[model samples]
Target chain A: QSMQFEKVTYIAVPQKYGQKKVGVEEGPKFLEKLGFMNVLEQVAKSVNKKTITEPKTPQETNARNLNEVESVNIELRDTIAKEYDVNNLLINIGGDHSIGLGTIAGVVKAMKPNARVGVVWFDAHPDMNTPENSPSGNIHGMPLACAVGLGPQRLTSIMPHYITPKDIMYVGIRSIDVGEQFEIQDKHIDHFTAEDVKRVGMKEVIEAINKKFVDYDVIHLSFDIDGIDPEFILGTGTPVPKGISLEDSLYFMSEMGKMKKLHSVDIVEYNPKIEEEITGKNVLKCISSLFGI
Target chain B: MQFEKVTYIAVPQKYGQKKVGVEEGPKFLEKLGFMNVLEQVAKSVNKKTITEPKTPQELGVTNARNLNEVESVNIELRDTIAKEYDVNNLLINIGGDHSIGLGTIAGVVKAMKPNARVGVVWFDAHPDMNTPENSPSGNIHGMPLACAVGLGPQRLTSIMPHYITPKDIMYVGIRSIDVGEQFEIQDKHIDHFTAEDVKRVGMKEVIEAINKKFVDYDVIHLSFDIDGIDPEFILGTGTPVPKGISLEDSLYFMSEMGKMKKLHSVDIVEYNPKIEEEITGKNVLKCISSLFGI
Candidate 1:
């Protein structure tokens, strides 16, 4: 299948460390050097022969790395709002899971605030904790909390509209920290734990997600490989146990492909440092699943 | 990403023997001086000083792998070095025990692909090939060479496995070996030259052999164990046998190695600062003095 859009806007996180991270600020530049835009070009070629335009400049950022990543979100949302007439889809890659915050915010800014959007959060950790509950205080792990309105002013501000727990659905959740369990219960988000996926079958889980949530105006799929079991993904630092197998993750992605509800797709947090040995294979498979191709 | 904690197998745990001089190693080095993150690589001999116990890891000593504290420190140091930077960043492993050489080298190889070229030059007195599977004493010091090439202990190697294939290694000194090491010698075709060969043939001959044997490698690592020197030259070790490389001859070799500069990484193993009683902490300070020269 081909896309009709003149340009597919791709947002990717270049470096995740504090801009102070001695050398990490060069991450996105490294990716570009390592064929990130070229990968997008090949995908664009496969879809359409239209003149391919790289976003005027790549958005190499972390939602939290900049003075406040919220500024980047504000900038992105406004730019995307302008592109409403020119672009149809945005392929947002990331340094961490929080890139979804900016994309959703900008996308919602271009569209109506009341527009309904469903969410698919695939990851091993619940990612539902706040700074108060975080053991590491790592902002990367807390993006889902913002997605569900449990975070700070920075992320919630950029959100398309505040996402209610009832609207967000999750799959492949394997482990939860002590406090995240309380929050997950406090907000009755539609979540299928790894145990739930294994017991009822991933097909049932994906079907329930589609039937329950994506029956809306928009569906955003956030694919984070940490949701897969750590042994299967030995490289990810945050990996947990009993998560979805590759077969199950792919099955869900294919099902989402059939829905066509997936309007904005995000594939993030493929860290080569922690998982370089197998990250290349996992990344290709995960991206393929995101597009349902 | 420097070391927060450092431990080593300084003294071997035999059935009845206490490990020699291991307890005082940290204290001796604490008194001397070493800095974190060598910011300047200078040609001249300069010194950087830090307070005792640079990091928490440098304080305690552990006897693991049936090896000494030096071996353990070598492995710990390598892990810290690899973590502080990207995988390809150059890693220079200075050894405390020859056993640490195997562990440090293996760690680097794991990060690299199997096709990655690694040249190993073992500068030691005796070929370290003794193992419980093959040795009478069961000293792990002897087993590092054997274990690094994928032999002995599925358990220990499981903790830190051999990442190098046997074909990439060459032994420069081999005056001492037990009867059974002969099997590993012929079976593995380990290249070796004794002190006699180095003396009769000179440092240039052995240098030529090293250059010729490891010609396929893109990078080379030198593992220098102090026991490679004869007991007369090395007065401060648990097991110092007679008739090994002379101190000046080995120093000459190091200078030439420094000039040839085929090596990106260098390791010095089996120095016990715990036992040696030089006010300068000569044993630990000794290796650095020579190394600091180049």
Candidate 2:
């Protein structure tokens, strides 16, 4: 079955505490300045959206905004799950990579209880850190782990559903922590690095990832702008020095769009506070590719 | 005496204008092996690229584009340049746009010895001398040179520890002059060589004049914007003005200046690889190679 964007639900979560920065919270506003709503309407015939106002939560947590992170995701989960229930193409604009916790959980939850859900987690960082192992203890670095039911009880219990590590695939991972390396190895998660994309090429990488995720009833795209090379996306929350090129980044996302299982996407961690962040054409391009426009 | 190891600093800033693509200049140049080319020319070269820990996002709006963000980035650049200059490291700064000249010049001035004098050689199509109020476009890329010599708003004019007199600055390859900015150029007595001047007197004669003009200064900065060259030669730059210098002349000028004993730092700016992919990438590396070539 082909994907159709008849009506799109725009869920804006403007919270940056998942990582530790005030600027990432400005992502939604910057995107709106870039005429994001108008652009979305071009792809979907009818567009409806909502901004998830982050309530005043406990500022102090063991994981530094763990309370806020969970609270926001709980709100995001309902927002996203509601969109999928109405058969609207869900586009989750985010505060940081931690926004994945809500989108991923919601996508998994919207499906039948026993239905298998697969994800294409595209990021420069694997984001595999748990609260215990994370050096920085930033929740943005740990959301991917929580999605696979590997984090603190509060996080692991965000949604009624849980995803196994085997069901998700990671791409464009250039920077991984020492602790994260252990988790990936132990969990046997299928992942590709920037080097892998460089050597094997994005075409081959996409083919392998698409093949694995095809078996699932639903596929989710969790894209962190930082996962892209800082060259293309330098004004992000956390920019790694070396990254995949703009050419490659475009190809990967668009190619994934062709896969029938691809249903929902979360584009996160774009900071407009940077001097260079004029208009987010790169993210806009990803949206175009996702809707097969 | 010959220069020691050269230091390459990449400033990936693009707050100068509303244009989206120019910020990527540093990343592409670095990837195209910007340091490796320098190492070939200079016997021992230091590849130290400065980076901001956080990319500033919330800057208040002003007539000047991204004023707060521009200030934030330039402040960081000035600090880095001050450190590099004190140690007497020769700097090759790959830039986002001409806006970086503000930071580089300020940094150089801060690090200069009390008695030392500094001169500048700016090579670009546009004069880049517009103030916030004077500019029709209000793009910071067009206003850096004006900022360098204590013109424009206090935020930019006072960035440097000391003032850089107009007489010490030389503008070369200038063809795009905003009508209002002509007054600033004439009043300040800032010397410049238009593309027309190069055609009248050979590039050799122009270089000879520049060498003699700045001969007394203890330090010299060569700030080159890629748009100074004809778009046919270098297609990917922010502002592509017509009737610019040739690729050969650009290489010749860079090589001639590379040999100067007082040559301290270089700024290569306005390259936008996002537009013309193939030609811009190769030419940018060629431009970098010429500057470092002994």
Candidate 3:
């Protein structure tokens, strides 16, 4: 099956509530300024775009912007559910990886009843820490756990249907917490670490992903810019050295573009204020590659 | 036919004014990988630097500060640009200051036929149109346009092989026009859009107006001053105005100019990387990259 879409909905999430770091919220706007919609229009028949409004109530949170995170993701979840269509691709240009909870939940909610939805998370960190186990207490680190029905009710309840641990596949993960490592091993979740990708090559990784999600009805790709090496992705808040190569990342994205089951995508954690314009341009290149442009 | 080659003329001149580190603008841009960007868009990319004066002349006269060095450096610059200028190739002049504009325009005009009509799109916070007599600061950077239009000192005006009429100039992002410049703009009816005008009328209309005004010109040259951009986005320049052009609009403007078939020469000036290097340098590169769609 060839990759084809009748329409594409671009959701801009400029939320930085996931962490205390500023500038990550400018990701969506920066990409838009770099002509993200124009790139999408090159591949899709029609493009729909909107920005998710951020909340203004400055509530102090011991859980690190939990209330604000919930507020933004609630709106995000609704927007995603409303805009999601099997014939259309929904691409979320993100502020942070915390928004991934809303995207995965919204996709699951939008799919037909009992439809199997698999999430392929590409990040330097697995982001599978529960609130209790997270060292930093940043909501960005707990989204995957929340999506798997293992976090606070305020976050987990946003998902109409919770995904099992087996429904997730992690790629480019190197920095994992003790709890996250134990969870991955105990639940037998499919993952390809940065080392694994280099050892086995992108071709084998692609084949493994294809086989892992063959029975799923649809797939959502959560791509954190930090998934790639810091040398290539210098603008993200958290920089991990010696991660995925730009060539491998591009090839993987191109392959993802051709996957018939991949229905939605989230490109997150691009902070233009961190480095030079190269970060924004490299992010655009990866995005353009994803659309086969 | 498309531009097949790109020639870069790096002028490490500091004699245009008293400031020292503006001479490092071209070098900083190269350090930031500007040549790599240029190579991606053109078949062959060539670079050359104009020689700076051995012992710079002191600012002796108030009417024209550092006149000897400015004249000496620009004569060589005029010769260099004239030699490298081509209709089928693109020439990018990276500057030490806006004073190089006089040499750039003169060289392009000299390279073309003696009777060729060359239009200039001057993007600057200042008009750079003050004559030596009317210039308050006596800075040569402020007098290049005046020299180009045959209104400056005789020595400067004589450098041009062909002089352009005021109608051949279209000024954009001009918010800091001098008293003399205002008089010149009104008396000569020089086409111009102030910073407020651009923000109100929009870049699309500004570009349309440019296309309409320069339709019959044989060639179009873009003279871009980094101070033309808003200080919020570019704080590295010497004379940064408060409400200048936005970086986004500048990028759009450059991108459109890059696509124009008549656009052959460009000048990026007044970028003092000493004030602020990383952000401002990267932004300047962004404008250059957008110009070539790189």
What's the TM-score of every candidate structure? 0.43, 0.50, 0.52
Residue A67 of candidate 2: its Cα lDDT?
71
Which residue segments of model 3 deviate by more than 4 Å?
A1-5, A57-62, B1-294
- Backbone clash pairs for candidate 2 read A123-A227, A124-A227, A273-B56, A273-B57, A273-B58, A274-B56, A274-B57
DockQ score of candidate 3? 0.01
Best by lDDT: 3
Q: Put down candidate 3 lDDT per residue, B1-294, tens digits, no spaces.
A: 335667778787877887778887877786666755664566344456676666754666688888777887788888878888988888999989999999999888888888798999999999999998898888889999999889989888898886888999999999998899999999999999999999999999989999998898899999999889999999888888989899999999999988888999999998898988889999999999999887
Comparing to the true complex, what docking class would candidate 1 get?
Answer: incorrect
Q: How much RMSD separates candidate 2 from the native structure?
A: 18.5
Query: Tens digit of lDDT per residue, candidate 2, span B3-99?
Result: 4556556676777866666776765664455534554544333333444323443335556877776777778788778877733557777777788
Q: Which ten residues in a row have the lowest lDDT in candidate 1 chain B?
A: B43-52
Root-mean-square deviation of Cα positions for candidate 3 versus the true structure, in angstroms? 15.3
Please report how far candidate 1 places residue A126 from its true position, in Å.
Answer: 2.6
Q: Report how far off residue B211 is in candidate 1 (Å).
A: 52
DockQ of 2: 0.01
Model 2: residues with Cα > 4 Å off, grouped in runs: A1-293, B1-4, B42-62, B86-88
Residue A145 error, candidate 1, Å: 2.3
The TM-scores that each candidate's chain B achieves against the reference are 0.72, 0.92, 0.97
Question: Which scores better on lDDT, 1 or 3?
Answer: 3
**How far is B127's C-alpha from truth in model 3 (Å)?**
28
Which prediction has more favorable lDDT, 1 or 2?
2
User: Model 3, residue B167: what's the lDDT?
Assistant: 93
